[PDB]
Design a protein around this ligand. Structure first.
Ligand SMILES: Nc1ncnc2c1ncn2[C@@H]1O[C@H](COP(=O)(O)OP(=O)(O)OP(=O)(O)O)[C@@H](O)[C@H]1O
Length: 253
């Protein structure tokens, strides 16, 4: 799902092409909305395990105290809400690729257990002493500055240096050249399908604005802007009056 031929993204693609056949852990950083899960899936797709599962553990979408349960599973009655026995994400990912997305959300106690798991594939369901293991290739991602998280004592140093093997620093959208308008056009077609519309072009002022705007929310912000336009309007072309706040006003400062 990567779109873009820009110089810094072609450097990302070279990393992916050369590292994907390895089982080496890839560690992805970049600003919010830069495509870290798309990048992770592209590593999976380029790897020999492309036809096996690609599982993303989205830590910022799981209640913090339940990430362990979601990752490792749990036996019935392990804790107050453990109504059923649960299969962990690690079992879903066996023989495939496991993305630990936004893993700096994990609390220090979970990080201590993760340290075992990433070395051997060994884990226990919450509530149980029984050990199992799985075969997974890791990809990690965070929006945080990992070295700052380690310095402030929020992320384990031993864990970081065993995960941080092949780094990818995704470029922010504002540094991606022709990619902004390439992604915008692809989103215009996708959102047109989603809304039952037919947008395909941008006027010249919109092209200029989108190319120069700093996109502090990166590709998610661009997705939200295109969705806003296609939901609210019906045209073949995006016009400057359609661009939502605060794009124009922030660019003016
Ligand atoms: N290069 C790209 N080309 C096309 N679509 C992209 C690209 N990068 C990201 N996207 C789209 O943007 C959305 C966000 O991607 P992803 O979830 O990979 O981002 P993230 O960096 O993990 O950030 P967020 O934390 O905002 O979710 C997805 O719908 C994805 O398809």
């Amino acid at each position: 799902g990567f779109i873009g031929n820009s110089l810094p993204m072609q450097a990302v693609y070279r990393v992916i092409e050369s590292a994907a056949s390895s089982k080496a852990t890839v560690f992805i950083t970049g600003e919010s909305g830069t495509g870290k899960e798309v990048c992770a899936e592209a590593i999976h797709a380029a790897s020999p395990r492309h036809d096996k599962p690609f599982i993303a553990l989205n830590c910022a979408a799981i209640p913090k105290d339940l990430i362990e349960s979601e990752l490792f599973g749990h036996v019935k009655g392990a804790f107050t809400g453990a109504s059923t026995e649960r299969q962990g994400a690690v079992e879903m990912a066996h023989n495939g690729t496991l993305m630990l997305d936004e893993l700096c959300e994990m609390d220090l106690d979970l990080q201590s257990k993760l340290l075992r798991f990433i070395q051997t594939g060994t884990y226990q369901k919450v509530g149980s002493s029984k050990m199992s293991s799985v075969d997974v290739r890791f990809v990690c991602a965070t929006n945080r500055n990992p070295w700052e998280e380690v310095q402030e004592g929020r992320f384990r140093e031993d864990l970081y240096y065993r995960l941080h093997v092949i780094p990818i620093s995704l470029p922010p959208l504002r540094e991606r050249g022709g990619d902004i308008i390439e992604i915008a056009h692809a989103l215009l077609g996708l959102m047109s399908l989603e809304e039952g519309k037919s947008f395909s072009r941008f006027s010249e002022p919109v092209l200029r604005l989108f190319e120069s705007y700093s996109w502090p929310g990166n590709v998610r912000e661009l997705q939200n802007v295109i969705r806003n336009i296609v939901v609210l309007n019906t045209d073949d072309e995006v016009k400057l009056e359609m661009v939502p706040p605060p794009i124009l006003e922030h660019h003016h400062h």
